[PDB]
């Protein structure tokens, strides 16, 4: 048909938009608001507040309450707001290097697998989002390992606690075992756990 509009320069804008994100703190939000709004729009996941945790009877049992507790505190309240936003960041640009709202745990009470699970469930649910923070976390996990796996997190942290990709992929495994501040998410280092190498 040939509408009478101007055009839609793919290039001007891919780059024009580029300058804005680069020097305009607020753009990340403007964009994550469309998907967040759009998701709330598709009615993809209505949220209820009639709280449903454990098999109920567990809340009632004497012995379990120790666990009834860890999970109870770990788990929160379905915020209508947080759930869309949580989903929206799965797909939207990244402009700050997400940090992991550091979860301080000790992993010394079988009921505490609750936390290792938060991540597995979480990484599965929104993995592209989880990917940014594999480091703060690789960071939490070895501790869990130092706790439930002494022998194995002995040779593992030692093989190297972070590695890099060599000109030919061969993973260059650093021998240190420094922590992993996001401060090097944008560097050439990868948290080591996820090396997924035998």
């Amino acid at each position: 048909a040939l509408r009478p509009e101007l055009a839609f320069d793919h290039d001007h804008i891919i780059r024009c938009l580029m300058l804005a994100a680069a020097n305009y703190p607020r753009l990340e939000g403007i964009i994550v608001q469309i998907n967040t709004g759009y998701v709330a729009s598709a009615n993809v996941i209505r949220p209820v507040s009639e709280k449903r945790y454990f098999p109920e009877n567990l809340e009632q049992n004497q012995s379990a309450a120790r666990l009834v507790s860890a999970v109870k505190a770990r788990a929160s309240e379905a915020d209508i707001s947080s759930i869309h936003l949580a989903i929206a960041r799965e797909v939207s640009p990244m402009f700050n290097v997400h940090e992991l709202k550091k979860i301080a745990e000790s992993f010394e009470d079988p009921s505490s697998i609750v936390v290792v699970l938060e991540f597995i469930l979480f990484a599965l649910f929104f993995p592209t989002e989880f990917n940014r923070i594999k480091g703060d976390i690789q960071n939490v996990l070895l501790l869990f390992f130092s706790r439930w796996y002494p022998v194995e997190y002995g040779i593992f942290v030692q093989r190297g606690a972070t590695y890099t990709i060599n000109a030919a992929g061969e993973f260059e495994f650093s021998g240190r075992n420094e922590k992993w501040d996001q401060a090097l998410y944008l560097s050439e280092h990868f948290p080591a756990l996820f090396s997924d190498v035998p």
């Binding site: 300058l19 759009y38 788990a75 989903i87 797909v91 050439e188």
Partner: protein, 236 residues
Amino acid sequence: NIAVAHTDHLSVVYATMSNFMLNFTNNFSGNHATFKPDQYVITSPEGSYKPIIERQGETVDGLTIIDTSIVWPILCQCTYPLVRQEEIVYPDPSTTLSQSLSVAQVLSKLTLPDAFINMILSGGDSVVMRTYQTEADDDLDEGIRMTTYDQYLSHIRERLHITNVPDPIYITGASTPDQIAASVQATHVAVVLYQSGVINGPASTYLRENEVLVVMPDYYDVVSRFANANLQMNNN
């Protein structure tokens, strides 16, 4: 109980979303090891350096921080649209596209003054120039031209990198009219960079014959550089 609606229904809204106007860039590639985002630095010869994805703690906006505790209400207590037996709704591809559009005009216009001024400042496309009078007679814009290295860096240099053609050549005491010719025969821009004692011998003459502005670090004694074996050159 949940994958029924979750993989089957959340997945689609997600895919449709992978194609939203603005959600540009790249987020993954399924591989946890190896995939590292692509970095972008707004670099400028004039000493500007502001990268796009920089890490700078929790902002006021309220996104930076990721919070995994959100997994539970989604997993345990959050009713669905196609789970307990409602009729799946569908966004109007309008609101949300007109909207992506809504931001783009608003967004491009905004960087409009900011981008506009620096250009006034850059003094876009144009190298200064001092033409030195050679062969007493022939005057004004009839000698050798040469510009300060900073000018050359800024304006003329970034362009050279893009065409691919191998960077310039070096006005050296030795290099004959041939070297200068061969270099300009490549870069095909007619600029020669100077960083070697006297220019002497011909070639310098070849330069009169050709624009070949020669770029050189800061001016002064710029006649003590050339070998005007017949007094014409003169730092003034």
